[PDB]
Amino acid sequence: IVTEYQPAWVEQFEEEAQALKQILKENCLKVEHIGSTSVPNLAAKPIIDFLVIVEEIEKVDLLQWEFERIGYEYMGEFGLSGRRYLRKGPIKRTHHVHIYQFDNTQEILRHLAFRNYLRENPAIATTYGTLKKQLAQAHPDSIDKYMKDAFIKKIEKEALKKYWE
Amino acid sequence: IVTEYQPAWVEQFEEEAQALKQILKENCLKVEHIGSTSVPNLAAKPIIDFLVIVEEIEKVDLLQWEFERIGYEYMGEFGLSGRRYLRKGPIKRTHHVHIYQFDNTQEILRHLAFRNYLRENPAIATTYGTLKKQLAQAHPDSIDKYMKDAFIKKIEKEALKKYWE
Numbered sequence: 558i559v560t561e562y563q564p565a566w567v568e569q570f571e572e573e574a575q576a577l578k579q580i581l582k583e584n585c586l587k588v589e590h591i592g593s594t595s596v597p598n599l600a601a602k603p604i605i606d607f608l609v610i611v612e613e614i615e616k617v618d619l620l621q622w623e624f625e626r627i628g629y630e631y632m633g634e635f636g637l638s639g640r641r642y643l644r645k646g647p648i649k650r651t652h653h654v655h656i657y658q659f660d661n662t663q664e665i666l667r668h669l670a671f672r673n674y675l676r677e678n679p680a681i682a683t684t685y686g687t688l689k690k691q692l693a694q695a696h697p698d699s700i701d702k703y704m705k706d707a708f709i710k711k712i713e714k715e716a717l718k719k720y721w722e
Numbered sequence: 723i724v725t726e727y728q729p730a731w732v733e734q735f736e737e738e739a740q741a742l743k744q745i746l747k748e749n750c751l752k753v754e755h756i757g758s759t760s761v762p763n764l765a766a767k768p769i770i771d772f773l774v775i776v777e778e779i780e781k782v783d784l785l786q787w788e789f790e791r792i793g794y795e796y797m798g799e800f801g802l803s804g805r806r807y808l809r810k811g812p813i814k815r816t817h818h819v820h821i822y823q824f825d826n827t828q829e830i831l832r833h834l835a836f837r838n839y840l841r842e843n844p845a846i847a848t849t850y851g852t853l854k855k856q857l858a859q860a861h862p863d864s865i866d867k868y869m870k871d872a873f874i875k876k877i878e879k880e881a882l883k884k885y886w887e
Contacts, residue, residue: 587886610886659883662827718824721752721775 559602559686559693566594570605573652577609580623586610586659591668593685596675600686607654608668614658617641629654640664666720667713674716681712724767724851724858731759735770738817742774745788751775751824756833758850761840765851772819773833779823782806794819805829831885832878839881846877 570590578585592606593599611617618641621631629643629652639661643654657664675682688708696702735755743750757771758764776782783806786796794808794817804826808819822829840847853873861867 586883612883659886660828660879662831662882663825665886666827666831714825717827718751718777721824721830 558697559600559689561600562596562598563594563603564597566601566603566605569651570594570607573605574607576627577607577654580620580627581609581611581617584611584613584616586612589669589672591655591672592653593675593689595672596682598679599675599682600690602689604650605652606668607652608665609654609656610659610665611656612659614639614641614656617656637664666717670716670720671709671713674712674719677719681715685712723862724765724854726765727761727763728759728768729762731766731768731770734816735759735772738770739772741792742772742819745785745792746774746776746782749776749778749781751777754834754837756820756837757818758840758854760837761847763844764840764847765855767854769815770817771833772817773830774819774821775824775830776821777824779804779806779821782821802829831882835881835885836874836878839877839884842884846880850877 567590574588574590577588587608587610589595589608589610590605591608592604593601594603594605624631624643628645628647630645630647632642632644634640635642639658641654641656643652643656644650645652655664655668659665675685685705685708688705692703692705732755739753739755742753752773752775754760754773754775755770756773757769758766759768759770789796789808793810793812795810795812797807797809799805800807804823806819806821808817808821809815810817820829820833824830840850850870850873853870857868857870
């Protein structure tokens with residue numbers, strides 16, 4: 558379910574980001590907070606999204622069971638080339654980790670530009686939050702129907718243009 | 723021929739960047755100085771490289787003859803998907819313009835990361851300048867043999883990793 562923005566999401570991000578870095582070690586170039594919970598004052602599902610950028614993606618497979626040990630399902634690419642995707646937890650969904658190699662610039666910028674653009678455009682973020690709240694009031698049953706797509710693609714495009722300016 | 727760094731290259735870049743913007747108008751999101759002449763104190767061929775980022779690449783074709791009017795050969799992709807490449811002039815080579823659409827993140831970051839990394843790593847820039855000077859002392863006849871490739875790919879990779887940190 559979508560809630561009003563929770564400042565605590567930042568705490569949650571930073572705590573888990575440290576946990577992730579302990580596992581990834583030198584292969585981890587950067588962990589970024591992404592997705593709606595990374596945009597102050599944006600209404601969102603309380604699921605923290607992590608963008609983890611690594612030197613070598615195949616090396617992350619060696620760590621599958623370390624991630625399982627801290628509660629992740631290790632999903633592999635899960636449909637996106639070059640990604641390693643992690644989700645937890647088994648009781649309720651709380652953390653989504655999107656791991657990419659440093660040379661996957663399209664995916665890395667898709668996430669960072671989208672975030673940066675919403676942070677700089679509160680009116681657009683408000684439009685997005687309002688839409689999400691409206692959707693939840695229409696599909697409480699279906700997360701499939703819930704999962705905004707045309708709006709997100711439009712904004713991602715505006716965001717990537719803005720990224721270079 | 724490779725010369726020691728010329729601070730005037732910055733002047734040359736800014737003057738022509740304005741000229742390019744006059745032609746490209748609203749389609750131009752950003753003009754960046756790239757390549758060796760954009761790295762202060764790096765020895766280089768005195769050819770200014772421009773990275774032009776646009777909303778719509780196909781729209782640039784409408785401007786081919788405007789670019790010719792200011793002295794460019796309009797080269798199209800010239801072997802790179804999504805690029806529009808311009809070179810001038812007819813008497814001596816002075817300006818190379820590399821135009822890409824905003825969503826060509828791989829090419830845009832290849833250039834910007836490479837530049838930023840050399841700017842932050844003077845020892846690496848010195849290695850690169852020394853190599854270029856050495857090469858010129860070996861192939862004064864052949865620009866083909868001159869045109870460093872393994873070194874550049876290595877540095878581009880280091881640079882893109884650093885870009886995210």
